[PDB]
Amino acid sequence: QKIHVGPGELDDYYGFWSGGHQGEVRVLGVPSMRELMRIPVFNVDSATGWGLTNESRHIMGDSAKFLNGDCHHPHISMTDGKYDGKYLFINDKANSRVARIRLDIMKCDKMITVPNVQAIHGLRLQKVPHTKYVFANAEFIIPHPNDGKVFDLQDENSYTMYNAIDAETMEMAFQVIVDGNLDNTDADYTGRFAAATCYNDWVVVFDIHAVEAAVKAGDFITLGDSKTPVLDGRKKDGKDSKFTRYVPVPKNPAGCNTSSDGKYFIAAGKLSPTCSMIAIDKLPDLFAGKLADPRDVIVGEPELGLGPLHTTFDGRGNAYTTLFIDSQVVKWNMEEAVRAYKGEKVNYIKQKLDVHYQPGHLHASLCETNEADGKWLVALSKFSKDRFLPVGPLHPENDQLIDISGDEMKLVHDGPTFAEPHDCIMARRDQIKTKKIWDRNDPFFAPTVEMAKKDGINLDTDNKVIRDGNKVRVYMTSMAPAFGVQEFTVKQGDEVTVTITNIDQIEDVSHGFVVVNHGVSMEISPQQTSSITFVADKPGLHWYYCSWFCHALHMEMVGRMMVEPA
């Protein structure tokens, strides 16, 4: 199979990598494993101005004050259990956020700080009938309220919550209080159930239908100043709530992965050298009180090796699980494991492949959908040791591409990556459709169009300087190789906003705008409007220039800001 993409040939899949502790999302081509694009999210990007521009800071809201993020779990929206190419979602463990990326423009377009929680870690999407909810785990137990009166993590009001975000509006849908700490999560192939591993064990299963019914009936509380409906999924005096069931699983379980045939939530055993297989079609009976014991929903518990952490699927009936301690990927047959659990003498283990070294997550192509195609697998290992040239005290993660198309897994490529991406997701080339040039009506800069409208500005044509007290709003078009406004004058101390509309119509003619020695930088792609605000705190003449190479005469796309002394 493939492996090599030579010059002039194109990759067959898109890969979306978490940016790890660096806070961005990265677009790779598969199988070449080359990085095609970086999408800034929680990081501040000098190149495009994300975190500096008004459009980006508007999307980030108050959290624009933070310059960091910590990403782990990238997932793509689905319709009828298949990737639909609309959105990517990702967590921020550092500042408790979820971000949405629009796959048509490859930019973060919405971001939410999850209220009344600390640290968004595990994250996955509803599959069916479509991605109505983003499900996100908050990892750390905190007091409620967290106002400094109570610090006791055993207090009855100290807990964490499972979080549901409306994928389309990017507002909170509901939160469910749980017992324990939440690790990973996944959803079924109907919309009724979701599940999460939780430590301090179990897999907690949520009846999303029951949660929704309670929200619609108004049977919920709110916490603090958030309107989010809050439901109590904890056990009370050994009694279950309508919303949750706690299924005992060993032991401090890690990954929680839904098989592509929709049959199983598979929890990785971590301390237990096993995975536990929860039969999704027994969950209705569990919630209806027809089973004697929550353990009755467990239909398999295969013994796999030391340190199972995560599981993925080839769509052919096999599961692939990382063994962190043994440092391998183990391929095993799920139905054979189920028969073994009944006492049948059958060997469900197909192969163990050594990986290098200490794998955490792994991801097979289309594995989160009923179209799982069994072509490529990436295992993301933490300790790369001698697999790459030494580069000082830090080391790259080793993301190893493995051909799973035949009976034998074959290691084909070691891909070093920065800041521990942790997990990734692949999509067929034909599942992703991107815009070549911006729509003038795009919501990404719609607030800036509205601001311009208030100033009487037609952004497609105008080159004007608006004076408003000590505020100056410069509006210009740009067309390589000239800025539409090549000089302007302000007073020292003025707050200057520069709004640039790139009116080039040629694909890939990106412009930039940098004000020398003012910390101002941003990108403006064809038909985009971008804006940036800074204080002209230095008298004298100050050059601005187009940063992105756009033309043979790129070096002459410059201008001058003249700042009259106070």
Q: Kindly list the residues in this chain that would bind ligand CUA in the complex (CB under 6 A).
A: 480-481, 511, 546, 548-551, 554, 557
User: Beta-strand (E) ranges in 285-408?
Assistant: 298-300, 308-313, 318-323, 328-333, 349-354, 359-364, 376-381, 397-403
The CA distance from 6 to 257, in Å, is 35
Instruction: Confirm or reject binding of residue 376 to a copy of itself (CB under 8 A).
Output: no
The residues that touch Na ion, with contacts defined as CB under 5 A, are 112
Residue 72 binds: one of Zn ion, a copy of itself, Na ion, none (C-beta under 5 to 8 A by kind):
Zn ion
For a copy of itself, the binding residue among 528, 529, 530, 531 (CB under 8 A) is 528
> Read out DSSP for 43-57?
S--TTT-TTTBHHHH
Instruction: Confirm or reject binding of residue 149 to a copy of itself (CB under 8 A).
Output: yes
Residue 511 binds: one of ligand CUA, Zn ion, Na ion, none (C-beta under 5 to 8 A by kind):
ligand CUA
For Zn ion, the binding residue among 72, 93, 144, 511 (CB under 5 A) is 72
3-class secondary structure, 244: strand
Residues 173-212 that bind a copy of itself (CB under 8 A): 183
Give the β-pairing of 202-207 and 244-248.
Answer: antiparallel
The CA distance from 98 to 502, in Å, is 30
In the bound state with a copy of itself, the residue whose beta carbon lies nearer, of 316 and 560, is 560
Residue 524 binds: one of Zn ion, ligand CUA, Na ion, none (C-beta under 5 to 8 A by kind):
none
Instruction: Confirm or reject binding of residue 270 to Zn ion (CB under 5 A).
Output: no
In the bound state with ligand CUA, the residue whose beta carbon lies nearer, of 102 and 511, is 511
Instruction: Confirm or reject binding of residue 436 to a copy of itself (CB under 8 A).
Output: yes
For a copy of itself, the binding residue among 379, 415, 426, 479 (CB under 8 A) is 415
Instruction: Confirm or reject binding of residue 547 to a copy of itself (CB under 8 A).
Output: yes
Binding mask 30-69 for Zn ion (x = CB under 5 A): ----------------------------------------
For a copy of itself, the binding residue among 192, 245, 375, 542 (CB under 8 A) is 542
In the beta sheet, which residues pair with residue 414?
Answer: 400
3-class secondary structure, 435: coil
Instruction: Confirm or reject binding of residue 165 to a copy of itself (CB under 8 A).
Output: no
Residue 106 binds: one of a copy of itself, Zn ion, Na ion, none (C-beta under 5 to 8 A by kind):
a copy of itself
**Buried b / exposed e along 143-156 (16+ C-beta atoms within 10 A):** bbebeeeeeeeeee
Residues 35-54 that bind a copy of itself (CB under 8 A): 35-38, 42-49, 51-52
CB of 389 to ligand CUA, least distance (A): 24
Locate 4 and state its tokens: 């090599």
550, HSE (Cβ side, Cα atoms, 13 Å): 29
In the bound state with ligand CUA, the residue whose beta carbon lies nearer, of 271 and 411, is 271
In the beta sheet, which residues pair with residue 118?
Answer: 140
Residue 290 zone, left/alpha/beta (φ > 0; ψ -120 to 50; rest) = alpha
CB of 481 to ligand CUA, least distance (A): 6
CB contact set of 546 (below 8 Å; sequence gap of 6+): 478, 480, 481, 483, 511, 512, 513, 514, 554, 557, 558
The CA distance from 373 to 394, in Å, is 35
Binding segment toward a copy of itself, per CB under 8 A, in 122-130, 330-338, 467-475, 542-550: 542-550
Binding segment toward a copy of itself, per CB under 8 A, in 225-233, 331-339, 354-362, 455-463: 354-362
ω into residue 31 within 30 of 0, thus cis? Answer: yes
In the bound state with a copy of itself, the residue whose beta carbon lies nearer, of 126 and 417, is 417
CB of 422 to ligand CUA, least distance (A): 12
User: Kindly report the CA angle at 435 between 110 and 502, in degrees rounded to 5?
Assistant: 85
